[PDB]
């Protein structure tokens, strides 16, 4: 049910992850991403019905979405502090600190700009839980469709519970999902930057992050 699913998504939320030169900043971000990748798998396994999917589908969904899901969490953590990216409890980065890593300043502005739109829309906790789960189930370019239908039904239920008119419910649903295209855009640019940083030997990449990068 929508009410039961939203509460299940809440309890599946990952714990906080505890992690300046161009190499040190990239080392902190990649180490943070590797730790968050472990927790994201545990988070996905708590999604009702996800473990019932085939391993091929489970691997394929996580392979295509992991960068978008991490950036979606970053924008949520940073939603109430314009000009700042709350990467981790001990890793708070200013916008101008993106000048420390070559080419990452444009991505920081992209992440902050999309974050500002979620702030202007006043993204709710219950909406964020549904949207982030939708990213995992949809990013991939029978039981999966039923799961995505349930999480989608939950999001319409959350918007319907806001009391706004039916026209405003369709508009808010559209505005939220239209911002996913920008989160995907940030994910694609972050993918290109990380592969370049790895190619240029600026940051090393290890274990899970390496596998998800290949």
């Amino acid at each position: 049910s929508p009410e039961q699913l939203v509460l299940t998504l809440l309890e599946a939320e990952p714990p906080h992850v505890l992690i300046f030169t161009e190499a040190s900043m990239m080392m902190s971000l990649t180490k943070l991403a590797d730790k968050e990748l472990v927790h994201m798998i545990s988070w996905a396994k708590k999604i009702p019905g996800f473990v019932e999917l085939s391993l091929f589908d489970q691997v394929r969904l996580l392979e295509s979405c992991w960068m978008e899901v991490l950036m979606m969490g970053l924008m949520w953590r940073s939603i109430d502090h314009p000009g700042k990216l709350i990467f981790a409890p001990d890793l708070v980065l200013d916008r101008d600190e993106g000048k420390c890593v070559e080419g990452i300043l444009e991505i920081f502005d992209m992440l902050l700009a999309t974050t500002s739109r979620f702030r202007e829309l006043k993204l709710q906790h219950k909406e964020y839980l549904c949207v982030k789960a939708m990213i995992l189930l949809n990013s991939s370019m029978r039981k999966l469709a039923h799961l995505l239908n349930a999480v989608t039904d939950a999001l319409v239920w959350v918007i319907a519970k806001s009391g706004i008119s039916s026209q405003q419910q369709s508009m808010r649903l559209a505005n939220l999902l239209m911002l996913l295209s920008h989160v995907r855009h940030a994910s694609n640019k972050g993918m290109e930057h990380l592969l370049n940083m790895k190619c240029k030997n600026v940051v090393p990449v290890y274990d899970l992050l390496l596998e998800m990068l290949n």
Partner: peptide, 9 residues
Amino acid sequence: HKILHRLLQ
């Protein structure tokens, strides 16, 4: 994809 398969099983 060893680590991803392992963490899923």
